[PDB]
């Protein structure tokens, strides 16, 4: 029991503010200040391993895939494009459930994105 304990990670570092600080640096700072202190000052980025391949086809839509589908549907309905063409495009890649359940998911997501677009393109 004759060892030194773990000292604190927080230490006062010397830093001089440069002349030209871009807006992207301020946006990356104010998105996450501790992450911008870690991965840019001391260049420590904790790189996690990628996710494994799932064993079955997607029966439901949740997470990043649902968010990307909603983002592309909102970018399509903001120009008043054909929702059925994007439905066939997402169904041809297998990202949608097979048969009627993918149609029901696309219909409810189209209803939600149309409710959002009726407020978005009202003042565009």
């Amino acid at each position: 029991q004759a060892g030194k304990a773990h000292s604190e990670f927080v230490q006062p570092l010397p830093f001089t503010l440069p002349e030209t600080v871009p807006l992207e640096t301020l946006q990356r700072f104010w998105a996450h200040p501790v992450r911008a202190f870690f991965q840019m000052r001391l260049q420590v980025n904790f790189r996690t391993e990628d996710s494994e391949i799932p064993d079955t086809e997607p029966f439901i839509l949740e997470g990043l895939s649902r968010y990307q589908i909603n983002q592309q549907l909102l970018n399509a309905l903001v120009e008043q494009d054909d929702a059925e063409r994007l439905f066939r495009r997402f169904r041809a890649a297998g990202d949608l459930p097979y048969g009627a359940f993918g149609e029901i998911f696309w219909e409810t997501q189209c209803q939600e994105m149309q409710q959002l677009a009726d407020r978005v393109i009202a003042c565009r």
């Binding site: 030194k4 773990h6 000292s7 604190e8 990670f9 001391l42 790189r47 494994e52 439901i60």
Partner: protein, 1129 residues
């Protein structure tokens, strides 16, 4: 009922022993085991004494079986000693010795029982079922070898996905809309039916017919809706009912809402305004037309497709799982019970049951509350009413808390109705008499407190030796049960939990603050003990309230442990840190992974250290060099040597032990290292272990080996333990903050009160919901009795007027819906003042109450002490000299033999061909073809190979011209194995000079370097043969890759001997042959008997060249004696 004496129990027929909580059940089992072994009882005894391999003891928990086996072995040894001495120190052993007349035969039987204790028939349920399936496999129909699987959820989810594929994919839109409204996917269906897929399949009340599909039910409901729509369209446009004060005049607008409702029948959900068109609701707010009655008949039953899909899933998924496990040949835990029940269900298996009556004519079944109906059906099939066989069901209906696992109290009620005799244990040896009187006072307020007729409660009696147990405070003697009534009218769930957790933490810190000064004590008679942190234990039921208690207790500087923590070690941050460290070790060239691994909490560096490491290139170079050394250790020695060198060079273990709260992190790191070493031996590649660690991080599945262990044992901690994990344990002081929290069962899965069978009601009938809520309340009362009967000195309760209903102030509270309030309020709904008066009504010397006080003064005092000096011993010398038994290798046209493939396997094939073939007989081509078939070579090579073999056999290898055909079977000896001793350290400089002094081939050949070899030397000589009274040696070398022409002359063979260093091998062969001929033949001379050593190169033997292929050498006859003197000493 009657009291149970272990020396007066009649062991005939079926007996039912009800051992209460805290009673000596394991002692009564050991007493009955000794009674069955010695054959005691007189008229109530067994007709014959039985051996150890005839007494069958069945207990569910494996640790309980191991403890019972050890206790029975100790009891057998103690009774053998007491019978040899005719005296003992135990009164039950005294009566056991008084019951027997003979001592020598009993001592011999106890000695034979001690020697046959390893073959005792004390198994579990599944172990006994597997043993009976493997023993009598013919009448049952079981395979001899099968593979048990631990997890069955993967195949169950696969079969559920297959059912959802083959049932939900071809449905049209109008049916798939309702299917999507019922469940989002197969995961919700599996989550619904997972409590019915495992265990015994329940009987569905009113099942659908086998020919009704989803489309027929959909068309039936569509027609039922369309009939009501037609009856609304026909009787529209009229209003004849009287307008009431409750009935507003906007109902015509609701009729307008029903006017736009009838457009298509593509939907499934009707409007709520039909609830306004009910005659039973309009009369309560005059309806004469039957359209309102047809609407009420439509809303009488819910229009749902759910029950048919659930029935098809329960019919398909279990069958697919059983078919897949029959195809793969695997087995499960319940599959042994199902196979034994199906074997006893058959006609021949009854005779198999007679074989079981031949195997064990007795049965003592412990823990009968945890009995499946298949187990009781088996035990009724074997041991119902046959003579000379006894059945002893030792259990407790007040402890049946494993209904979630598969147990059922209705099976115990059927067993109690079937058997005739009942026995109970009166004495309780665990708790103080105050707690015993509190338990007997709380549970005997009303009649049938467990709400069932077949579960009666009896007042237990306390022990005479523990009647002086007192938990004393600074003021006076604290009572046994202290119901802390939380004050207020109505409170929520989280606020009540927070307030009772704060009150419990305040009581814990008051007991610890007064316990360290000698004020709060545990007194046994006159002996006293201060209350440490390990004495107080909080009994919770869920994980969320356990975390609430731990957070409310760690705020007051009180450490607490969670005994029911089953979380995996791979889900913590230390597993990710070890993964980053292994990725930095495997790839130390890229600085990004090394920088991400160095900044972890395992290394423990400041930001200034990381900045100076990024600035200084030489320190990063040293880090990369030491990580390359770690990679070299990891590639040569393994996982744990690399981890130990990393923890010793960086000294991170001492830094984690110096840091407060880092010992649990160090134990997690050590367990992760042990698991990585256990998984690294089964994997060959180095990246495969990293992928396995990342997968086990991504897989939070809980195995028995991959769970978190206890961090420390020396430091006393407050042990939080759930009620199911506290069954059979013992705690001095017990706090129950959330004993009033209850949860209402929603699903309708009950048991019939007459047939005692599992009835699953897929329709929402209120009678099934009430019958399930009654069983839920009985389970909550059994959990209350389990949680109450674990305290020894003092128990504290948290009472509050908890309201599960969403209304805040409704004038009544839901404590009568809980288990504690059913005994406090006598099963009657009351208020908070009524609950307080019911609490204050049952006030005795053991039962008191106090209000909940919110307040904190100071957390605690550490009162640490110094550590004495300690040192480690150091080894003075080397552990061992270089002793190793080694060999010579340790000290170092289109078809032609030149076109033969050169390798080790063809060399060994030609060596085996020359070993197995006889030299006198001519070579047969079909034998060469069969040998090439056995070896696996090409068949076209065979007719050239045999003539080449005869060309080898026709070529003589001697200085006189002696062929191999002249050697008889007694003269030849193939593959002589010799061991040669050497007691001196073999110096290469003293040996190579002695070789070069006499051997002429050592002119070149710079000397090889080898360590000092002391010990034995192995050798395998190919052939030794005598001829005309002279011995000769023959070896085979057949690699010969670099020669295809006739260039293998004596110069090329001498160059090959100098390059491959076969001179030392031939010299050791000459030394071994000289020692062999000296040991075997008396009057032996080296010059007279030995003739020389012949080396036979197989690919160099030609028909026209007799000298090519053979190499004859004779030593100088002076090197052998000096080498023998060197090897001897």
């Amino acid at each position: 009922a009657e009291t149970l004496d272990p020396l007066r129990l009649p062991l005939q027929g079926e007996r039912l022993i009800e051992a209460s909580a805290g009673t000596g059940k394991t002692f009564t089992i050991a007493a009955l085991y000794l009674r069955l072994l010695l054959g005691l009882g007189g008229s109530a005894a067994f007709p014959r004494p039985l051996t150890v391999e005839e007494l069958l003891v069945v207990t569910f928990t494996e640790a309980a079986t191991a403890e019972l086996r050890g206790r029975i072995r100790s009891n057998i040894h103690e009774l053998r000693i007491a019978c040899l001495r005719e005296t003992t120190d135990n009164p039950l052993y005294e009566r056991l010795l008084e019951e027997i007349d003979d001592k020598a035969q009993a001592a011999q039987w106890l000695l034979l029982a001690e020697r046959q204790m390893d073959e005792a028939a004390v198994f579990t349920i599944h172990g006994f079922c597997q043993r009976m399936l493997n023993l009598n496999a013919f009448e049952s129909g079981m395979l001899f070898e099968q593979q048990l699987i631990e997890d069955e959820s993967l195949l169950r989810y696969q079969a559920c996905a297959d059912f959802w594929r083959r049932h939900c994919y071809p449905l049209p839109r109008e049916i798939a809309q309702v299917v999507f409204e019922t469940w989002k996917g197969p995961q919700a269906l599996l989550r619904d039916i997972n409590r019915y897929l495992q265990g015994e399949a329940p009987v569905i009340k009113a099942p659908p017919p086998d020919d009704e599909t989803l489309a027929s039910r959909h068309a039936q409901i569509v027609a039922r809706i369309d009939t009501v729509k037609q009856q609304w369209r026909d009787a529209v446009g009229e209003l004849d009912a009287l307008i009431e004060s409750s009935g507003i005049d906007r109902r015509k607008f609701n009729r307008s809402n029903q006017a736009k409702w009838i457009d298509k029948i593509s939907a499934w959900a009707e409007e709520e305004t039909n609830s306004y068109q009910l005659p039973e609701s309009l009369e309560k707010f005059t309806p004469r037309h039957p359209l309102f009655e047809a609407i009420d008949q439509l809303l009488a039953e819910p229009l749902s497709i759910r029950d048919l899909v659930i029935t098809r899933a329960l019919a398909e998924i279990r069958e697919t799982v059983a078919r897949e496990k029959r195809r793969r040949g695997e087995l499960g835990f319940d599959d042994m019970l199902s196979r034994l029940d199906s074997a006893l269900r058959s006609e021949s298996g009854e005779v198999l049951a007679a074989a079981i009556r031949t195997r064990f004519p007795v049965a003592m079944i412990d823990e009968f509350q945890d009995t499946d109906p298949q187990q009781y059906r088996i035990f009724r099939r074997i041991w119902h009413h046959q003579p000379e066989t006894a059945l002893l069901l030792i259990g407790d209906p007040k402890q049946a808390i494993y209904a979630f696992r598969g147990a059922d109290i209705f099976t115990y009620m059927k067993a109690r109705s079937e058997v005739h005799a009942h026995y109970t244990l009166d004495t309780n040896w665990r708790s103080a008499p105050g707690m015993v009187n509190s338990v007997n006072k709380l549970f005997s307020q009303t009649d049938d407190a467990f709400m069932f007729r077949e579960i009666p409660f009896i007042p237990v009696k306390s022990a005479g030796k523990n009647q002086a147990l007192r938990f004393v405070f600074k003021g006076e003697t604290q009572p046994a049960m202290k119901m802390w009534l939380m004050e207020g009218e109505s409170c929520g769930v989280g606020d009540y939990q927070s307030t009772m957790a704060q009150v419990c933490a305040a009581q814990i810190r008051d007991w610890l603050q007064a316990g360290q000064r000698g004020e709060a004590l545990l007194m046994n008679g006159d002996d006293a003990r201060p209350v440490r942190a390990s004495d107080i234990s909080v009994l919770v039921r869920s994980r969320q309230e356990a975390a609430q208690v731990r957070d409310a207790l760690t705020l007051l500087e009180i450490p607490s442990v969670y005994l029911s923590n089953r979380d995996s070690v791979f889900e913590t941050l230390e597993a990710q840190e070890m993964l980053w460290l292994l990725q930095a070790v495997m790839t130390p060239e890229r600085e990004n992974t090394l920088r991400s691994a160095l900044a972890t909490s395992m290394m423990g560096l400041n930001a200034l250290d990381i900045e100076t490491l990024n600035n200084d290139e030489h320190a990063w170079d040293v880090v990369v060099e030491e990580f390359d050394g770690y990679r070299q250790i990891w590639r040569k020695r393994g996982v744990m040597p690399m981890l130990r060198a990393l923890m010793s060079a960086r000294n991170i273990a001492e830094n984690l032990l110096a840091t407060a709260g880092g010992e649990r992190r160090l134990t997690d790191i050590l367990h992760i290292s042990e698991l990585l070493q256990e998984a690294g031996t089964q994997l060959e590649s180095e990246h495969a272990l990293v992928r396995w660690l990342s997968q086990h991080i991504l897989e939070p599945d809980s195995n028995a080996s991959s769970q978190q262990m206890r961090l420390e044992s020396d430091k006393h901690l407050v042990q939080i333990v759930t009620i199911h994990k506290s069954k059979g344990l013992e705690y001095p002081l017990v706090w129950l903050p959330f004993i009033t929290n209850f949860r209402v069962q929603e699903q309708a899965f009950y048991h019939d009160r007459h047939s005692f069978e599992a009835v699953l009601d897929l329709n929402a009938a209120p009678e099934s919901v009430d019958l399930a809520e009654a069983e839920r309340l009985a389970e909550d009362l059994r959990l209350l009795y389990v949680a109450l009967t674990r305290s020894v000195w003092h128990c504290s309760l948290g009472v509050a007027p908890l309201v599960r209903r969403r209304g805040d102030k409704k004038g009544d509270t839901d404590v009568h819906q809980s288990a504690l309030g059913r005994l406090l309020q006598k099963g009657e709904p009351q208020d908070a003042a009524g609950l307080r008066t019911c609490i204050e009504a049952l006030c005795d010397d053991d039962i008191a109450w106090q209000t909940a006080q919110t307040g904190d003064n100071q957390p605690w005092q550490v009162n640490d002490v110094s550590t004495a000096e300690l040192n480690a011993k150091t080894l003075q010398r080397l552990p061992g000299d270089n002793w190793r038994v080694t060999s010579y290798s340790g000290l170092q046209p289109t078809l032609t033999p030149h076109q033969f493939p050169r390798g080790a396997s063809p060399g060994t094939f030609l060596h085996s061909l020359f070993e197995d073939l006889d030299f006198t007989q001519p070579v047969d081509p079909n034998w060469v073809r069969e040998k090439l078939e056995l070896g696996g070579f090409e068949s076209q090579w065979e007719p050239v190979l045999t003539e080449w073999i005869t060309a080898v056999l026709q070529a003589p290898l001697n200085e006189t011209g002696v062929s191999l055909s002249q050697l008889s079977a007694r003269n030849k000896q193939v593959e002589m194995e010799f061991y040669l001793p050497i007691s001196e350290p073999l110096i290469a400089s003293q040996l190579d000079t002695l070789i070069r002094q006499f051997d002429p081939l050592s002119a070149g050949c710079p000397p090889l370097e080898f360590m000092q070899v002391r010990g034995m030397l192995k050798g395998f000589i190919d052939l030794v043969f005598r001829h005309e009274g002279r011995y000769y040696l023959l070896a085979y070398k057949s690699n010969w890759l670099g020669e295809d022409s006739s260039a293998y002359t004596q110069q090329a063979m001498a160059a090959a001997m100098q390059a491959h260093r076969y001179d030392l091998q031939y010299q050791l062969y000459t030394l071994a042959l000289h020692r062999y001929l000296r040991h075997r033949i008396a009057d032996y001379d080296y010059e007279h008997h030995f003739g020389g050593v012949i080396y036979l190169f197989l690919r160099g033997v030609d028909k026209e060249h007799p000298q090519q292929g053979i190499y004859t050498t004779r030593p100088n006859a002076g090197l052998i004696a000096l080498m023998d003197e060197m090897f001897a000493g």
